[PDB]
Amino acid sequence: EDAELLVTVRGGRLRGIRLKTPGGPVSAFLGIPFAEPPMGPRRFLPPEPKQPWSGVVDATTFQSVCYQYVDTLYPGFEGTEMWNPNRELSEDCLYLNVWTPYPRPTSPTPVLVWIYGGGFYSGASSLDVYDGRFLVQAERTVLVSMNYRVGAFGFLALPGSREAPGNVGLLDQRLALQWVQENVAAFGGDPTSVTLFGESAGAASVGMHLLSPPSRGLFHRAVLQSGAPNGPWATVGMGEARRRATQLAHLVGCPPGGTGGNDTELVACLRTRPAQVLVNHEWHVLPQESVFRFSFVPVVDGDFLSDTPEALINAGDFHGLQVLVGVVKDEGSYFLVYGAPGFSKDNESLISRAEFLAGVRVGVPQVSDLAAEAVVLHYTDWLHPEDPARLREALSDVVGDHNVVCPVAQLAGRLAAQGARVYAYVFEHRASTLSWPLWMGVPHGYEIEFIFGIPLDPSRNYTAEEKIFAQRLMRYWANFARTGDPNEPRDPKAPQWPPYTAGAQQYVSLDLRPLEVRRGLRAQACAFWNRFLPKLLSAT
Amino acid sequence: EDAELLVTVRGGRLRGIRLKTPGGPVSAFLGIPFAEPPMGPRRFLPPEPKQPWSGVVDATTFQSVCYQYVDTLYPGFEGTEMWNPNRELSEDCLYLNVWTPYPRPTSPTPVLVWIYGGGFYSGASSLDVYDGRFLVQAERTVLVSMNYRVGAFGFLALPGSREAPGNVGLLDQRLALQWVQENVAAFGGDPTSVTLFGESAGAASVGMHLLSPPSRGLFHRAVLQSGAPNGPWATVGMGEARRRATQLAHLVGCPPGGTGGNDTELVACLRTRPAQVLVNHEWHVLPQESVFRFSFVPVVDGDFLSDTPEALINAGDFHGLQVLVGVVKDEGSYFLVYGAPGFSKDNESLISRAEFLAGVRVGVPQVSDLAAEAVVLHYTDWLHPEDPARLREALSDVVGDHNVVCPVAQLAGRLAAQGARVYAYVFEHRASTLSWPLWMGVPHGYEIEFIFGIPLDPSRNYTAEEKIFAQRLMRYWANFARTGDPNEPRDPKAPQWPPYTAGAQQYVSLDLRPLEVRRGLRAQACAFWNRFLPKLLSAT
Ligand SMILES: *[C@](C)(O)CCC[N+](C)(C)C
Ligand SMILES: *[C@](C)(O)CCC[N+](C)(C)C
Structure with missing residues (x-):
């Protein structure tokens, strides 16, 4: 004692x-x-x-x-x-x-x-x-x-x-x-x-x-x-x-x-x-x-x-190193209420075409008018170019991909292709206690309380499923710390978490449902940011 | 007599x-x-x-x-x-x-x-x-x-x-x-x-x-x-x-x-x-x-x-005019055997990444290296960037959209939005008599024999379904000639063909199945060609 x-x-x-x-x-x-x-x-x-x-x-x-x-x-x-x-x-x-x-x-x-x-x-x-x-x-x-x-x-x-x-x-x-x-x-x-x-x-x-x-x-x-x-x-x-x-x-x-x-x-x-x-x-x-x-x-x-x-x-050279990387579903929504015109945490933030075009200049500062034009092209739904709810989600993807998702995928690809064993995830559960509005989905930083087991605190009104979810996530992180492998070293029944390779680009989604393997960390969107946009900025 | x-x-x-x-x-x-x-x-x-x-x-x-x-x-x-x-x-x-x-x-x-x-x-x-x-x-x-x-x-x-x-x-x-x-x-x-x-x-x-x-x-x-x-x-x-x-x-x-x-x-x-x-x-x-x-x-x-x-x-001004416009499913495949490296009508034309990049310079002549880079970005599947069958279909879409599909959609949109009543179609049936290889899909120009009723010729080995298909298409074209409206002026049971508007962008697909309404003449791809690419060429 x-x-x-x-x-x-x-x-x-x-x-x-x-x-x-x-x-x-x-x-x-x-x-x-x-x-x-x-x-x-x-x-x-x-x-x-x-x-x-x-x-x-x-x-x-x-x-x-x-x-x-x-x-x-x-x-x-x-x-x-x-x-x-x-x-x-x-x-x-x-x-x-x-x-x-x-x-x-x-x-x-x-x-x-x-x-x-x-x-x-x-x-x-x-x-x-x-x-x-x-x-x-x-x-x-x-x-x-x-x-x-x-x-x-x-x-x-x-x-x-x-x-x-x-x-x-x-x-x-x-x-x-x-x-x-x-x-x-x-x-x-x-x-x-x-x-x-x-x-x-x-x-x-x-x-x-x-x-x-x-x-x-x-x-x-x-x-x-x-x-x-x-x-x-x-x-x-x-x-x-x-x-x-x-x-x-x-x-x-x-x-x-x-x-x-x-x-x-x-x-x-x-x-x-x-x-x-x-x-x-x-x-x-x-x-x-x-x-x-x-x-x-x-x-x-x-x-x-x-x-x-x-x-x-x-x-x-990253041989002999194991890395675990991942993002949440809506990496960008959190920051839009900090400056993007038309956005407020207390309403539906149904923005207009004009506010969307202004928001792009705020969410992607220090880029040419032509560079912004490319961002608007890639992130517009040309079948519904003025749908407010679609432009809302589009701007959240603009900020999310530019600042988090694409920078991460870039790092994960090269790490795997240079000796490191890399595992990738996507957090897709929205806490029942989340006080942010519904349209923000799962925002930046709201996986942390599940990694630390906060739902187990009896003075908090979490659900029984979320408690099991927390214990599962804590095992993943702990197992990666003990063995360098998030999968349980011997149990086979639970679905397995394959490493992330630059070719297959495999990752799992974390939510109340069992593990599901997917391919591509927004590969189409991220090719614009990681490949084409740099060249568009070098050429005036 | x-x-x-x-x-x-x-x-x-x-x-x-x-x-x-x-x-x-x-x-x-x-x-x-x-x-x-x-x-x-x-x-x-x-x-x-x-x-x-x-x-x-x-x-x-x-x-x-x-x-x-x-x-x-x-x-x-x-x-x-x-x-x-x-x-x-x-x-x-x-x-x-x-x-x-x-x-x-x-x-x-x-x-x-x-x-x-x-x-x-x-x-x-x-x-x-x-x-x-x-x-x-x-x-x-x-x-x-x-x-x-x-x-x-x-x-x-x-x-x-x-x-x-x-x-x-x-x-x-x-x-x-x-x-x-x-x-x-x-x-x-x-x-x-x-x-x-x-x-x-x-x-x-x-x-x-x-x-x-x-x-x-x-x-x-x-x-x-x-x-x-x-x-x-x-x-x-x-x-x-x-x-x-x-x-x-x-x-x-x-x-x-x-x-x-x-x-x-x-x-x-x-x-x-x-x-x-x-x-x-x-x-x-x-x-x-x-x-x-x-x-x-x-x-x-x-x-x-x-x-x-x-x-x-x-x-x-196009008031008082009726126009019927449309494309076939694979507008670009026909021309690739006329110069695109790796393409031959007598094999699967499974091209490589290197041949695809060379084919883009042939299929989109007179454009800057940067402009070609944008075309490669938009038309690459970054989840399978070296799949030969996908790059084959991609190059066919490059030539098709640049020369036919996007120029047509541009014309149809402005005509409808400037007084003309416009109907749009997409021909998706591949004739059973088609001597071109399978991978070309339905090629440029192989709707014509169905508009002219060629399947009714008894000395040709067409199918019974294709004969009914021809008679249906001939009525569409004839009805548009008599009334300016492809739909039969009184019969309601057969599905109807809505006009094409710049907003809804509605079109029908023509094949052996009944009429099916769709929206968008490759709206995502065509925004690149009709909007972004012109600006990319003005700026050096
Ligand atoms: C990141 C830039 O550090 C943002 C952190 C935001 N919270 C809410 C997680 C602190
Ligand atoms: C178009 C440019 O006129 C191409 C016509 C090709 N055929 C095969 C229909 C003649």
Whole structure:
């Protein structure tokens, strides 16, 4: 019992907490420091390892959320506020959490590291939908989740500078992975079987960790849910990163007056500003009106990413690696209520032809009028070119395919055709608790509560079928973590999940019904985005 | 009886012939001269009306075919030689034929004028598949068919010249229509109910007669089968026409030596050459390797066509006109054995990816590498990008849509949306007698034998179902000629044929089964050709 709630790691000692699930207790260690607080002169810099302490650190409650913008588009609405911070905001925020089974496993157990999404500008490991108590109890594995800096504090980059090098939010994630290497065995975890998994910007982070040598030696399998490192939103160039960082400094009064504008004094002035001041101007440095675009994201600096994610995927060897990838049915609907004209979460969003054509300029920013014309051609139903419900679904497919589905299929194809064993899925169940409107289908990010077993929580009004569905999905993810193969290593009756190959392009659909194999991750639509559109942009 | 085999028209007297069909005799007048022979100094010039004669002209057999190239791609093969000339070749060839019922109708009967196709380079009114004896006997109407000059003799144009103005093959057709106005009443025909119908280049001719004022006063309804005046092959510009005419003169030794090259002496030298000499070099003036392209076709001269067919369709009023238009299921397969690499009528033509990409350059000549890339994107099955049978069908759709199906749908839409009542069909029956291979489906031009009632010929091995099918199709065409409405004016049980509108885009499919209404003349594919591709070519 309480003998297992006190663990000694290399920094010192910790007191854990025992959480209860309907089928047994778990041991949790919430709020372990893994880095020095990145405040004062440490803002925008890479993290430093946490110095050893004396006494015991209390690891019984989640620590503070990293400073981030707070969504206020629909105040009081469950759909948006379920992702909003549930702890006080502070720059002192680099803490990680470990869930471990009770009684503690006697032999090394596979470790899953969760990396949250939120467009690299928001999110926290302390959210209720990321509670690792159900997954660890049912599948008897070790779950780790960390906080990493987001927004300007994580990804403001002045390239070439030493004061604001950029990507330090990814460096926070890497330090946590070194920490799991050096300490997970104390909780019963195998440091030789580590599986990263993330969603949205978490999946792009997992992807970028695949393409940088220093991080690859810290894990062994990868799960990318609804995101990829080569997505048009997950990366920015050195020239644009400099422009957004400088525009931000200008908006907050740096350089004052008055004085020259070198990088050292720009960051020195940015470091004297209160954290909330930088946050209130973060959306004001975007170049266009757009959905699915965020200000401060990973930069191609030549260090963490020696080349663009596209180049690094094409010129890489991935033998001996297993990857699980997939999308939900309606990847694009979620973002349309964030800017697309005619869209509102409180009505049918039956848009007109004129609003559809305007929405295309928002959903596909930074492209020529001719390029937009190609998008309108491919995504119009010329038998019903003005049907509002069809144009609604079309724009959702425009945003979905351009930002998630096609970037993912591109990554999955090349990974399989270059040594990696890849499994692909499509999440097609819509939760009965979903507070978003019906026309959004299954939106971006609403598979997570089923991967984490949230339906097992008795205080939630899920259905009996959805509880069995959750337990099935948890086994898939756990099995992939133990064996690298989502299929149960011996049972044959349940339908099997074939790998994804560049030729057959096979994937399964996850819903209340048994597994069904399909072919093609929107192959027709994705050929436009992955093949034809790049050439259409090179030729003026 | 034989009292009705002698008719007096405004030129003189004629002796006809009585032909037998399984259900009654018909009266035919084959070989009536309607113009002076365009020989010697009359070559390349517009036709002159036939001067009155004395005695009686024998109108009992077909006259001579206009000089034309003779297909020799498959000597001895029924599929090709059924379209080859079946009478002696001569420049003395401007003759027309009238079929009329027996006994002669007592009240004015609607008149159908047939205009044959053959890429404006071949064809004759004397072909067996254009025999008007079955259609006139069963539906008791008047059928007229003429010969018009083809190839250089009909369409060699030096624009601005008076010696070779061009389009005189169309002027031969117009003179025949004036003739039907001035003489059809002598055979029992109503000069106030004239219906043009043609196929391939015959349908483009019917279309161009709709867009030129002097010819519109000569007919009242139009049927366009597998062709349109705005097709990329049916028209050439003044600059290109001059180049092809001059290249032809060069190949036959004009100007000799030696002397300057003005238009008057070029045509004067072209007129001293034997007809067979000009024919043997006709294909040698084409600019590229291509299918569905022909050397000497109608020219935009500003006279017969004041503007391009595209401009004239867009800026025209078509109220009070009824049009019947349609295509066969596989418009493109026929031409692939004329140049597309990998294609042969004697094997399965299972082409490779490399041959498909080369075939696209042949089937869509004169377009940029980027434009071809768009065609490959839209017509590739990215789930089976190297399936030979799928690429075979894809290339047939490339040629079919680009040259026939999309040019037709473009014309039908604007006609309906500008006053004309339009009916649309798709011919989907493959004759049991078809000697072409199976993979060609139903090819270009193999609805004609069913419109003319050829299956009723007892010496042919057609099936009993196909005989009923022919009689049904003949009623459709006849009903449209009498009433302007293909549906039977009173019977309701048989399914009805709704008009074609730009919005609903409704059409019927013609085969052994009852009428079935469908929507969309390849709307998705045709939006690429009619909307997006033009813009892709303007932008370099
Ligand atoms: C992705 C860009 O990180 C989007 C994440 C959105 N939520 C709702 C999943 C946080
Ligand atoms: C059209 C271009 O005239 C093609 C006609 C081909 N035949 C086989 C119908 C003559």
